[PDB]
């Protein structure tokens, strides 16, 4: 097809050096499945529109689609699965600037409901760290020290949205070079692991240390910040009512 061919070649340029030929082939062969899912989400009207968007790198959606996409986020909250190592760097590494997420650029999240539907079995037990690594298309063994989770609760998510702080990823913000349009993550031939994708404001963790947090997480299971201080897109610090939780995922 004309647009899919143009998509194929645009991919070959922006993909980074260390994306295997196998994964890249997988990205090429599954491309239409991800176009169709975006069309059925009414993220775009057609395959063509989706491929033109990937090629143009302008990830621009109708505001009505984004408002409908957010409903499940307002209902259940937002989730960001992380490794232990990446968690500690948010608190301990000074060049990480004591924020969770890339400061004013935000944190990639999915809906909390989508991660509970997917990372747990039918009976609600956490899946193995192997499965979850595979679902999230991260390197083998990345979560062997446990699967940690950031959680914006429903109130925090509604109040963040009232402020107009929820963002959709753009073609130049999103897998590193495997990003696709449609507010959706790319997940291989197993398209059932594709979750919605949005960008939430970063969390300020000024004067907090990973020691205390991880200690609290072994004690209670989670560390929590009542009414946390988020980082608005303009770089400001601003306090928003709600609960932001950090936790180690547990059956």
Residue number, 77 or 204, with CB nearest to another protein = 77
Least distance (Å) from another protein to the CB of residue 217? Answer: 18
Q: Describe the chain by its helix, strand, coil percentages, rounded to 5.
A: 45, 20, 40
Give the nearer residue to another protein in terms of CB position, either 184 or 202.
Answer: 184
User: Minimum distance between the CB of residue 122 and another protein, rounded to whole angstroms?
Assistant: 6
Order the strands of the 243-248 sheet from edge to edge. 198-200, 107-111, 78-82, 148-152, 243-248, 222-226
Phi and psi, residue 120, nearest 5°: -115, 155
Beta carbon nearer to another protein, 24 or 39: 39
Interface with another protein (CB under 8 A): 40-42, 65, 68-69, 71-72, 74-76, 111, 113-114, 116-118, 120-124, 141, 144-145, 191-192, 195-196
Nearest residue to 197 (alpha-carbon basis) of 31, 37, 56:
37
Nearer to another protein, 99 or 245 (CB): 245
Tell me how crowded residue 236 is: count the other CB atoms within 10 A of its CB: 11
Taking the complex as a whole, the smallest distance from the CB of residue 219 to another protein amounts, in Å, to 21
What CA–CA distances, in Å, run from 229 to 95, 126, 196? Answer: 19, 30, 25
CB of 172 to another protein, least distance (A): 26
């Amino acid at each position: 097809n004309m647009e899919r061919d143009l998509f194929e070649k645009k991919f070959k340029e922006i993909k980074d050096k260390w994306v295997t030929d196998k994964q890249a082939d997988e990205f090429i062969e599954t491309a239409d499945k991800y176009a169709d899912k975006a069309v059925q989400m009414s993220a775009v009207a057609s395959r063509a529109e989706y491929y033109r968007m990937y090629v143009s790198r302008k990830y621009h959606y109708k505001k009505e689609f984004v408002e409908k996409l957010k409903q499940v986020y307002k209902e259940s909250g937002a989730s960001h699965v992380t490794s232990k190592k990446d968690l500690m760097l948010a608190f301990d590494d000074a060049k990480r600037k004591s924020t969770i997420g890339r400061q004013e650029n935000g944190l990639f999240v999915t809906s909390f409901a989508e991660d509970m539907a997917l990372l747990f079995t039918d009976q609600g037990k956490l899946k193995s760290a192997d499965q979850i690594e595979n679902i999230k298309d991260v390197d083998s063994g990345k979560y062997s020290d446990g699967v940690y989770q950031y959680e914006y609760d429903s109130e925090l998510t509604k109040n963040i949205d009232k402020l107009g702080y929820i963002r959709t990823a753009s073609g130049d913000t999103r897998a590193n070079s495997l990003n696709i349009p449609g507010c959706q993550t790319w997940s291989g031939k197993h398209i059932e692991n594709s979750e919605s994708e949005l960008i939430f404001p970063s969390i300020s963790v000024k004067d907090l240390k990973s020691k205390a947090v991880l200690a609290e997480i072994d004690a209670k299971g989670y560390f929590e910040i009542i009414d946390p201080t988020i980082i608005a897109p303009n770089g400001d610090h601003k306090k928003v009512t709600g609960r932001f939780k950090i936790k180690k995922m547990q059956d």
